[PDB]
Symmetry: C3
């Protein structure tokens, strides 16, 4: 039920040499059920999975998963941009680790540099009022605690990274929430889940993201996200 078995790091035979139950579960549950849940499509699941693997330092799995993402209709430029985005959100080393595995995936598919996310291009429109509010809140709270970090947050992230067009805002928020959930960073989920929902991700899609990540990032990480998600959904109803 899993596509492109030959592209896997470890073969079904190899997995069965240690844990045949795991191989069966991979086929019947992970690929046969989770990946088949229609509330979130294969393209979006690929973005969520790539984000999880990057955030969790499981870059070797990316050769297979990046190839699958391309097959599922994720653009090379979107994979490219996910890596750049997660340099900031997961850390530079986590992004750098992707270079070998993803370059291999691209090379096999004949994906040249001309298909990648632009170094510099026309920014998306900035909601100036919401940004003025965001900057004021952070500056008032932490401006004298870490002035450099506060300034970088504004200049590098909210006035640049988040306006880069190579991921649609919805998709950039999607990869962000996936990366956060994947490493249990529940403190930052409220802001970014609200942003994702504002950007067009549906509540059921968000529930599917959490559900998908139970498998890729472990049950406790998915479980920890639930009260945060619940609070967000309830607050939007007020």
């Amino acid at each position: 039920q899993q596509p492109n078995v030959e592209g896997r790091r470890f073969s079904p035979d190899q997995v069965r040499s240690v844990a045949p139950a795991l191989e069966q579960y991979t086929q019947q549950r992970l690929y046969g059920d989770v990946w088949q849940r229609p509330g979130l499509n294969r393209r979006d699941r690929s973005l969520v999975t790539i984000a999880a693997l990057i955030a969790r330092g499981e870059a070797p799995a990316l050769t297979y998963y990046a190839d699958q993402a391309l097959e599922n209709g994720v653009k090379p430029s979107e994979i490219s941009e996910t890596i750049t985005h997660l340099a900031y959100y997961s850390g530079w080393g986590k992004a750098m680790a992707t270079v070998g595995p993803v370059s291999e995936a691209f090379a096999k598919r004949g994906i040249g540099q001309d298909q990648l996310a632009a170094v510099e291009s026309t920014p998306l429109p900035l909601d100036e009022e919401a940004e003025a509010q965001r900057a004021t809140t952070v500056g008032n709270q932490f401006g004298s605690v870490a002035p450099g970090l506060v300034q970088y947050t504004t200049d590098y992230l909210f006035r640049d990274l988040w306006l880069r067009p190579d991921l649609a805002p919805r998709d950039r928020s999607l990869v962000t929430i996936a990366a956060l959930i994947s490493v249990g960073q529940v403190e930052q989920i409220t802001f970014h889940l609200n942003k994702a929902l504002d950007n067009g991700l549906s509540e059921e899609q968000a529930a599917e993201v959490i559900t998908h990540l139970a498998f890729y990032a472990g049950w406790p990480n998915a479980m920890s996200a639930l009260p945060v998600a619940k609070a967000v959904f309830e607050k939007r109803r007020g």
Copy 2:
């Protein structure tokens, strides 16, 4: 004082080329003292260590540590089942990473597939009342937040994984608490430590688990577990 020095990823000579104090501490403190603490036996320490290495993405160390576990009397089927269990609790990629290192450990010992945990076998008895209570609690709290995840929790975990006989309930709880502590997932320790104690793990054994993990998962992770453990021990006395 450390057994099977030749089976290590890095030799004592190699460790001494960077940090001779670390090599000395490994011999005198880790192997000479911690591993020798009689409150928790070598077999259980091996299970705790394997769980920690899996959860923390330190799979390369597993060739040595899985071999040691087998020497310490952990069954191949128990190692097999730990991997499958932690696919769910640590994440699929963390379990998958074990395949290469553990297959090598098994191959060297002539451990064939006939010795592994069963794909499907007769489930252990389910405490139907405690399960009805568990399902009701979760369903009431998060049923409309992530219905898919709630259903999978019931169907995949509590009505299947936890009833698989290839780990005794005590040992399955042992590996779970070890994996949780190892990545600082304190939110889920209350439930699983209670379950471990219910399943027959002693309070002193649990204290030894936390102590062992200070070395393998870092002091802060062990320290973070202490107030949770304290609260559990005190609550059971009420």
Copy 3:
């Protein structure tokens, strides 16, 4: 703007084959701006970076970063001691992972074992009253919860590791706060940041540490440290 381009795991060409924007950001922002911020010098930034890479299981990057640290004036003995220190604070496996990459860095520079941190040497002076207070607090709270861990905390850490002269107290605290921030261990930052400030790290230096780590350990980790740092700074003013 990045020194020793040829020593990198992945070349600029390789990074550009996946994410040319990331390569540009590395040059212009990470190396061209962050590393150039004068509030924290290159030597201290190297210690912070090594600690982050060790804590986050990004040991492969260490060949380049350890070489850079040596170029920046970090002593071989200080790198040696950072590894030993983080065996305790990040975990044994995280320290062990450094052996290959750092040994390579040392070999290329002709750094022999005679330049490494001493296995045993004359301890630094212990503040006996502050230690009596620390031991009493921990013993009263957790002495009967995990007696072994409480005893090891005293004997292995505060009456040995922290008195080892191969890192100055300021630098040992620096590597500790870096390692904690890098994996989001906010629970332990209050104690260790106070200790760092007591040991001579300035508040602006601490702010630069957090800022540097936003890039190496991801924005959310740096952001999570801010309220802890704020509370510490404010408390010292009372």
